[PDB]
Design a protein around this ligand. Structure first.
Ligand code: MG
Ligand code: MG
Ligand code: MG
Ligand code: MG
Ligand code: MG
Ligand code: MG
Ligand code: MG
Ligand code: MG
Ligand code: MG
Ligand code: MG
Ligand code: MG
Ligand code: MG
Lengths: 52, 96, 236, 114, 95
RNA sequence: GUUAAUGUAGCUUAAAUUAUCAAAGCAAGGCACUGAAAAUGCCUAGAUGAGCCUCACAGCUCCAUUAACACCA
RNA sequence: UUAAUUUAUUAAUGCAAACACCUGCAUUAAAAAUUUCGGUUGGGGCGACCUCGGAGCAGAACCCAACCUCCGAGCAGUACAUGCUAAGACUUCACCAGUCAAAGCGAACCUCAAUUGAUCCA
RNA sequence: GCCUGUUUACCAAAAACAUCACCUCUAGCAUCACCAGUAUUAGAGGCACCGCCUGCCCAGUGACACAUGUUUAACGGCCGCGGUACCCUAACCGUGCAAAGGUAGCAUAAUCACUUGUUCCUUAAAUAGGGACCUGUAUGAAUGGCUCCACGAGGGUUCAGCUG
């Protein structure tokens, strides 16, 4: 039903965080707090870790 | 056009008894006497064994000169363990 | 163990050699074959299966003179004492062999065949097609190993480019050379198949112990195996 | 075709040990009923369970088949479904004839094909 | 554990203890929390903080790990640039 | 005895909500007339009785129905 | 044995190597080898059951059994600061786990009773 | 159970095992078993003389052949559901499922239960014995089926005798 994706940052790279989304609706793109640059950066998903 | 109907019957197991009458809707009871009377031919042959299996395109008979019951599907879901819901032809049309 | 095999005599004699039963047992004292043991005592009469062999300072074909046709304990066919020149030897009798027969053992592959009589030894090159043979060799000079059991015969099916073809009693074709010698006629003691052991005692007189009582379930090996006849075995 | 009933009375139920097909439990157990009919002479035993709550309620079910033959005879619901369910065995061995006759008509026509 | 060994006759250490626990010299045993890196997608940020904490042990847990190590691991270690050098002393205690 | 399964139009399976077409029976509709091919309708208390919502669905009240365990001393 | 683990073993095939046998490696056989045959249970088997939560028993701090009585759970939804740190407490009668949390930093102008799985390892 | 034989030495001698006979399978061959043998032979098995016979089934598992086939005297298996049959009698018709649906024979048997089946003989009286009938819903054909001759320290029944 749901999917545990990994969301890779764009600026201040290397910072990943895992969130959940539906299997069917499109890839995620979120505005999430990046502590590397201490800002809010766009985060774009890259993989699905597990189809829970 | 010539004769085509009778798609999507769930047969129980591929067999020249149930790929017969399911398609020419009768039972197994005349078919077993069609079997024992020279009839119930295969693809222009003679079936002397009424459990010979049936794949895609195997052209049934019974010679009423005939009425064929051609086959093409696999259809691959399951219909409560009569799984083989296969489409199948129907005829009453003559053959040389 | 201390098992020396009795087969130690290195010379041919007419005389009966005292044998030893094996018990079905090896030289290591253990059983290898079950169901053998303890029949009537027998003595061994040594059979010359190289049927055409010249004696010392002789060569070529010879005739032989049957002296007796005699029961043999060690085989199912009965044997023939034949004497030619100045030596005696045991050979195996053909179907209607009597004393006073003159049997020919020849070396001659000719231009034509031989209308060969019932008990006489010839090469398979010297023989018509369809005749019944016995005591076949598989090599020229080898000695008889094939059809020599009782009543058995084999037809000579065809001759090829330097080669004669047999049909064994098991209906299997065997291809040999044309110059290995085999006698005509079937072997003696027909109606060995038509025999009755009658009682369990006459089975144990022939040295045959009873089978085990262990009930064995039959497996996959036990159908009515309708197999192809095995392809021709060639000795060339 | 129901089986005609039997009264709550007139049934001399004795309780004995009976046959014992076991080690020590079945020598000392008065499990066998001897449920009798007082009118007719029909004596029924039961060691069908190791429990009288199914011995006695099944001993009653046997007795109402035996005393049924007494008050009806050979035309009873206890012989109707003996002659109706062995009626089929003449419809099973005659059925099996006509197909072992047509299994030689199709076996001799087999292999006499060329 | 092995109370007397077969070669020298000394006590042995259980090496499964040494690879998980840190003994401070004062007597305490620092450990990690079980599941601190497992299934963090279903844990809360308050619970994920609790799992990332170097946690002291019991009295009978510390007594258990003391019988399981030799006196080499109960020792003054004067390292170069230690992150737990400030924890070997047991300051201001009134028992 | 005890769980356990099962119930389909007149005839066979379906359908995991909403009920089908496949035969048979009403005829008419191509065809000179019969045969399909069509184009109809048609017949299921979904074997019960209550309604929890809104239910062949998800469960007892149920009726018949078949399998299977009721043992050791 | 159609339990798990093996194929050393002989026997076949295959590839190497040597210029068929011997050797090494693979597969497929048979023959075998080693090991186990959970627990609760109004005796054991059979049936059922095993972890978590809510209600009753257990009336009012806490706790409280049952092959005791009745309901559930093995998710979903919304965020995307569901960032980081840190006083003091709670705690399922131990441990492990599990809870709540002021302030502070950075920003802003979680819902739900349970909704679960340690270590080693990959 | 065909027979004579064999067996749990020290609780079972038997209906068990063997056994002639019958069939299936494997093997085309020499110098230590088989064998100084050679397919009418040898080895591995099943069943049990003879007489009369051994029905259907190759889907599975096996084995053999890769002509996806052959094979049951290989492992084994040989169903049911509805329902008109009337001196208790023509499914006389519809079907489901399977590889095939149990044929001949025999039969309450050493054959689940019911079970002391029903009935006749035998007995003063019979849960015993014997002859019949019969679904036997769990009979049945080399897991061999059924007759039958002799034989058995087998297991039941019995006439007459005879005896503490
Ligand atoms: Mg034998
Ligand atoms: Mg035997
Ligand atoms: Mg236990
Ligand atoms: Mg109990
Ligand atoms: Mg506590
Ligand atoms: Mg704060
Ligand atoms: Mg005997
Ligand atoms: Mg002996
Ligand atoms: Mg004894
Ligand atoms: Mg003895
Ligand atoms: Mg026997
Ligand atoms: Mg005797």
């Amino acid at each position: 039903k749901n999917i545990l994706v990994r969301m890779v940052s764009e600026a201040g790279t290397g910072f990943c965080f895992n969130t959940k989304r539906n299997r069917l609706r499109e890839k995620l793109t979120l505005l999430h707090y990046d502590p590397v640059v201490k800002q809010r950066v766009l985060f774009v998903e890259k993989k699905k870790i597990r189809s829970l | 056009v010539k004769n085509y109907k009778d798609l999507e019957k769930a047969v129980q197991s591929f067999r020249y008894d149930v790929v017969l009458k399911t398609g020419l809707d009768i039972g197994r009871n005349k078919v077993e006497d069609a079997f024992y009377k020279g009839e119930l031919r295969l693809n222009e042959e003679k079936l002397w064994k009424k459990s010979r299996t049936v794949k895609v395109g195997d052209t049934l008979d019974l010679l009423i000169t005939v009425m064929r019951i051609l086959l093409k599907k696999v259809f691959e879901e399951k219909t409560e363990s009569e799984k083989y819901r296969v489409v199948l032809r129907r005829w009453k049309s003559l053959k040389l | 163990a201390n098992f020396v095999s009795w087969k130690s005599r290195t010379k041919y004699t007419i005389t009966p050699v005292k044998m030893r039963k094996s018990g079905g047992r090896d030289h290591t004292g253990r059983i290898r074959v079950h169901g053998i043991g303890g029949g009537h005592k027998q003595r061994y009469r040594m059979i010359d299966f190289l049927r055409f062999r010249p004696e010392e300072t002789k060569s070529g074909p010879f005739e032989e003179k049957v002296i007796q046709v005699r029961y043999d304990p060690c085989r199912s066919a009965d044997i023939a004492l034949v004497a030619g020149g100045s030596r005696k030897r045991w050979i195996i009798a053909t179907e209607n062999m009597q004393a006073g027969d003159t049997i020919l053992n020849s070396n001659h592959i000719g231009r034509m065949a031989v209308a060969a009589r019932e008990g006489d030894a010839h090469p398979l090159g010297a023989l018509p097609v369809g005749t019944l043979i016995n005591n076949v060799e598989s090599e020229p000079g080898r000695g008889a190993q094939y059809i020599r059991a009782a009543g058995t015969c084999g037809v000579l099916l065809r001759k090829v480019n330097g080669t004669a073809i047999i049909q064994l009693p098991s209906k299997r074709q065997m291809q040999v050379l044309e110059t290995c010698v085999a006698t005509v006629g079937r072997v003696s003691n027909v109606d060995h198949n038509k025999r009755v052991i009658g009682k369990a005692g006459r089975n144990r007189w022939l040295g045959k112990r009873p089978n085990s009582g262990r009930w064995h379930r039959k497996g996959g090996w036990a159908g009515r195996k309708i197999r192809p006849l095995p392809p021709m075995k060639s000795y060339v | 075709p129901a089986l005609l009933s039997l009264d709550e009375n007139e049934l001399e139920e004795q309780f004995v040990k009976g046959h014992g097909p076991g080690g020590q439990a079945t020598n000392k157990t008065s499990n066998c009923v001897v449920l009798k009919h007082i009118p007719s002479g029909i004596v029924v035993k039961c060691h069908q369970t190791r429990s009288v709550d199914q011995n006695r309620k099944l001993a009653r079910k046997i007795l109402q088949e035996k005393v049924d033959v007494f008050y009806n005879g050979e035309n009873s619901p206890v012989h109707k479904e003996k002659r109706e369910a062995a009626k089929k065995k003449q419809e099973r061995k005659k059925r099996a004839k006509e197909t072992l006759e047509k299994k030689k008509l199709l076996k001799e026509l087999w292999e006499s094909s060329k | 554990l092995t109370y007397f060994s077969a070669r020298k006759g000394k006590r042995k250490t259980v090496k499964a203890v040494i690879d998980r626990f840190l003994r401070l010299h004062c007597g305490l045993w620092v450990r990690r929390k079980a599941g601190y890196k497992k299934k963090l997608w279903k844990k809360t940020p308050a619970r994920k903080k609790r799992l990332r904490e170097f946690v002291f042990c019991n009295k009978t847990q510390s007594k258990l790990l003391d019988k399981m190590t030799t006196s080499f691991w109960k020792r003054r270690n004067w390292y170069v640039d230690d992150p737990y050098q400030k924890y070997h002393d047991r300051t201001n205690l009134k028992v």
